[PDB]
Design a protein around this ligand. Structure first.
Ligand SMILES: *C/C=C1/C(=C/C2=NC(=C\c3[nH]c(/C=C4\NC(=O)C(C=C)=C4C)c(C)c3CCC(=O)O)/C(CCC(=O)O)=C2C)NC(=O)[C@H]1C
Ligand SMILES: *C/C=C1/C(=C/C2=NC(=C\c3[nH]c(/C=C4\NC(=O)C(C=C)=C4C)c(C)c3CCC(=O)O)/C(CCC(=O)O)=C2C)NC(=O)[C@H]1C
Ligand SMILES: *C/C=C1/C(=C/C2=NC(=C\c3[nH]c(/C=C4\NC(=O)C(C=C)=C4C)c(C)c3CCC(=O)O)/C(CCC(=O)O)=C2C)NC(=O)[C@H]1C
Ligand SMILES: [Cl-]
Ligand SMILES: [Cl-]
Ligand SMILES: [Cl-]
Lengths: 477, 299, 477
């Protein structure tokens, strides 16, 4: 299936990747309940491991140390651990839904990386340098930052790549390309690896236990990924990947995504350094977003004050607005702005045609209810606006009188103007994803952000207030 | 005549029979929340002539605080006092989100029945939007006990929620005519808007100040070889970030305190507790004895 | 001819427009030397006026008042003057090359207009409101502001128009469309009127006097305009026009251009008010341009200081530059920036392809000579750059080491990516002009301004200085 994307239960595939092996034990780690088919090979054992004790399989020394490392469900990282045999492994150990999971890998980076981003003083400076830095440090052929839009669609906002590889920078992909359940998993596991997208996966034995339960591999780093995603990667010429969840204000802001054109695993010490880097990156981004929003609000307040200072020296507030209204484009990012006052229109930049305005103004008067009213899909509100979508597909309306239906109107252009296959078919390529996204946002503009709406409301109060203060001078006129 | 439709019944109310702009001019230049609210009680009392005018602000739990007051000299003051959430019940606060101006003409008057109270199909008359609606006898009795015979209140709406009330009390019966009510509602709407902007500017100033204070500390950290020593010398200055009565530093299993803090020897228990619930995040409570029973003693 | 545009001697057409009449007299205003053919009609006279005295033609009272108004070559404006007959005229009087020219028109605006622009606080705010204001006040169907680029090409930077008329906003036209000699005239006469582009012009008798001299009509408001321009207007559906020269720092910055779709004259009092408005507009624009440049330089100095403050806390200046270089895009408007250091490239935004950089860097090393070096036509310097012109057609290079050939490189995209007929043919339409301009700027980017170059030089010194200060730490590395 390729339509009901968010149904695939990716936390219980019944398979692991081939670069390690897995043992599942009970809560107390006494009995082996499950094992991956490759355990015998990597551990030097034979036959069915299930039913044997942890001590029989791994020895008392190792089992003792593993119990002691247990003490939410964040995996313990135990490098360079030895079995009774003498074979050496990096072991990841965790408990979830009262099953214990043991993963085996045969075997100042972070601080230095974080020093190179800590002084970034803007979001763009942070994200630009990070792809470049992650590529140099970890050696992946391509490193991207993929940012979630409010509807869940993704945008490639930074990129560093081998010169011969194609660029994805500035492209968008549909929400469905990283499904809902994938985004929930990535809220739990913050670092993920695919070692070989063409490798042969390793079954967990048994996939369903006697009581009908699958093995939940949510927190297992050896978890095998959806074959849909793996096929998407092979179509791109990508053989391996790593991604880091970027967590801002407790939500999934985006991903750092690394692609390699040949198979590639990161050792445990390298993964640990990279996770640590990702956590600092997340924190710094969060603070930088917050400072940017503050700067934006502070700037808007100062611009309102400058206008109000002019209003206090003018006898005719309407004339002042007719002369000044274009300057309100500084408050909120837009492609056009206009003023509807005394049933007359004045426009600046990209606005609907002059003669389409009275219909628009009647519409605004009927839904505003004396509040800010905004849409990024104007043709859904007014069917006839479809024709001028190329110039104005979004609108935000600010009442400027407590008494009359006068408004300041902000506009945005439709968003399109500011820009091998395997058995499952050509749906699984960036070209098709991008085309699907473009089609989905036709007749639509970039959504008005929360910041935009907070500024608008502050502006409403400023303008409604100064109008009331001038109201008897203006009736005198 | 006041006329409206609600739940598809029409209600007609009859009263036998630049104020707002001038009032609003006298508050529009307020540059702080305290300046706005202080002057407003004084101004509403002078303009509308009520014996007492209060501003009653809702706490986050719904309890109310009297934050401004203007009154006849002989009347008692309620300023700085708090009252339980239950004193203005949940359903009252919901009504006051719909009707923004309310009048009680005579708390000892004899009320007038609506005929019929329940119609043939079993429905009562919903008077949510009716200005002649009779008030709860519980509230009316509360007023009579205070020596209050009449009242008027204005809902203060900030960011679409009920921030508080402007509450006017008279010690004798009193009605506002329709033109006066209209002027006062208009005033209340501007008051609400200005308060909202002033709260928002105050919050911005507060955040901006905190960011600058952090930068000053970080600038010092960049010239010091020993960050722990710097923190031991400096930690009291972090009291500037967040209003508090005390602050302290728990580092390398040693405590340093400033101002009002738990006793020195109660700190290790507190620190063990914090270590077990923080999970590397900010953790806060306003009821410490609910988290640590032994904290009751130093409350 | 349509190729040697700047040859037409437009100051001596031998004709005037039909909405007035002209008399030419000697320096002392004793004898009539020339007259327009329509003088007899408008003045109520008969026969050949030439050779008669000023007093015989106009009467002693009028001639007396005209002599007294004479006292550089700026015309005297005498409204509501009467001939001996009793006919009433608005008279414009001036002397140039020792000929006296008398023009006759049968017959708080400025302050109020200027009050409505004086508080503009940006160039964009000034120019946007001015077209809107001039259209409302003077009633022309279209009012444009046309700004000269450094090469003399024009850009329509503001527009107000009847809704049904086409928009010219954002369009450019070749330098040749307003020829060199036209731009020189417009430096002398600041306000010009064409009353009727389809009207029949009125010959001056004689066009050439006995000694072989034409009548120089440079300062005459009744001067007939080039038939090339008049035909350009008719092709646009324009019957009348008025233009105001915008003079900034003693040069022709641009024009305010008004179009009417039917014949239209401004009376003398209205022209006087509009000239006055234009002078204030010019002055305010000049101050606003100067404040904008200051703000721009101040911002750049603060950004350099922020970077230098970081350099003072870092042991490795090269690493800092690799992490930070994208932030230098804030100094100078550009579409891309990059860093060439230790024979390695790092790019951001729109830059040449990675593998084209070493050739570019060799080129820069050979022409820089340790100075800022810039071009807006990169393929003229490096033929192979033609292929990547769409991404990078302009480059500015800043040396960042006194000793090594390391550079910071700024780039701009080619400019095309940031965007009836009469007997003389289709050359004379805005569509063809615009197409000619577009063709002329192929493979070219927006030129680096003087401000850009001043900032670059300040940046050079900052970066060369901090490199020298770090030079022994870096050799240690
Ligand atoms: C109908 C289902 C579809 C689908 C599902 C899917 N995607 C998943 C992971 C995932 N997708 C992407 C998308 C991209 N990566 C890219 O580099 C580009 C480039 C253009 C795109 C569009 C990413 C980054 C990820 C996460 C990768 C990671 O390493 O974490 C998953 C989950 C896979 C899992 O088992 O965790 C699913 C189920 N993708 C589709 O395109 C459709 C059709
Ligand atoms: C168990 C119920 C109780 C209760 C109910 C109640 N109160 C209501 C209105 C109301 N209460 C207050 C409280 C005060 N006013 C004061 O001046 C002071 C001074 C100290 C206090 C504590 C106010 C301001 C209001 C609103 C007044 C207004 O004019 O809008 C109502 C609703 C009344 C209605 O019909 O709208 C109810 C049901 N009050 C109690 O004290 C308890 C015991
Ligand atoms: C080969 C010569 C050509 C030419 C000559 C020419 N132009 C002149 C005046 C002039 N041109 C323009 C151009 C435009 N006006 C517009 O509205 C638009 C719209 C797209 C354009 C391109 C202007 C504004 C002016 C000045 C107008 C004014 O009123 O001052 C003149 C001088 C005319 C004179 O006698 O002063 C000349 C000689 N124009 C061409 O297009 C070519 C081919
Ligand atoms: Cl963001
Ligand atoms: Cl508050
Ligand atoms: Cl300019």
């Amino acid at each position: 299936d390729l339509t009901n994307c968010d149904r695939e239960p990716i936390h219980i595939p019944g398979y692991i990747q081939p670069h390690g092996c897995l043992i599942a034990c009970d809560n107390a780690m006494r009995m082996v309940l499950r094992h991956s088919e490759n355990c015998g090979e990597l551990l030097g054992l034979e036959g069915d491991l299930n039913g044997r004790t942890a001590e029989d399989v791994l020895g008392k020394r190792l089992v003792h140390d593993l119990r002691n490392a247990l003490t939410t469900t964040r995996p313990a990282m135990l490098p360079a651990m030895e079995t009774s045999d003498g074979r050496s492994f990096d072991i990841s150990l965790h408990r979830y839904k009262s099953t214990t999971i043991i993963e085996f890998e045969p075997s100042g980076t972070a601080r230095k990386m974080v020093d190179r981003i800590r002084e970034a003083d803007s979001v763009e400076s942070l994200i630009s340098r990070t792809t470049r830095l992650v590529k140099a440090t970890l050696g992946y052929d391509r490193v991207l930052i993929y940012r979630f839009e409010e509807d869940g669609a993704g945008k490639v906002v930074s990129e560093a790549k081998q010169p011969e590889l194609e660029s994805f920078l500035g492209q968008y992909f549909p929400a469905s390309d990283i499904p809902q359940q994938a985004r929930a998993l990535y809220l739990k596991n913050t670092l993920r690896i695919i070692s070989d997208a063409s490798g042969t996966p390793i079954p967990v034995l048994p996939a369903v236990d006697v009581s009908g339960e699958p093995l939940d591999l949510s927190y297992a780093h050896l978890r095998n990924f959806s074959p849909i995603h793996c096929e998407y990667l092979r179509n791109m010429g990508v053989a391996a990947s790593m991604s880091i969840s970027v967590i801002v204000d407790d939500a999934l802001w985006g991903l750092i995504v690394c692609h390699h054109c040949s198979p590639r695993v990161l050792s445990m010490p390298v993964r640990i350094a990279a996770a640590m880097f990702g956590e600092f990156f997340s924190m710094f981004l969060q603070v930088l977003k917050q400072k940017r929003r503050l700067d934006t609000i502070n700037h808007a307040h100062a611009a309102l004050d400058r206008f109000l200072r002019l209003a206090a020296h003018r006898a005719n507030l309407e004339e002042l607005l007719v002369d000044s209204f274009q300057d309100f484009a500084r408050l909120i990012p837009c492609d056009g702005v206009g003023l509807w006052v005394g049933n007359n229109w004045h426009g600046h930049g990209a606005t609907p045609p002059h003669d389409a305005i009275p219909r628009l103004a009647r519409f605004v008067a009927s839904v505003s209810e004396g509040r800010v009213w905004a849409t990024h899909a104007l043709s859904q509100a007014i069917p006839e606006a479809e024709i001028y979508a190329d110039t104005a597909a979004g609108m935000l309306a600010i009442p400027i009188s407590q008494v009359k239906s006068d408004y300041l109107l902000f506009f945005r252009k439709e968003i399109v103007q500011n820009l091998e296959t395997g058995p499952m078919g050509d749906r699984l390529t960036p070209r098709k994803s991008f085309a699907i996204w473009k089609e989905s946002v036709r007749l639509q503009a970039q959504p008005w952000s929360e910041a935009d709406r907070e500024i608008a409301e502050t502006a409403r109060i400023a303008l409604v207030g100064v109008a009331f203060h001038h109201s008897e001078l203006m009736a005198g006129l």
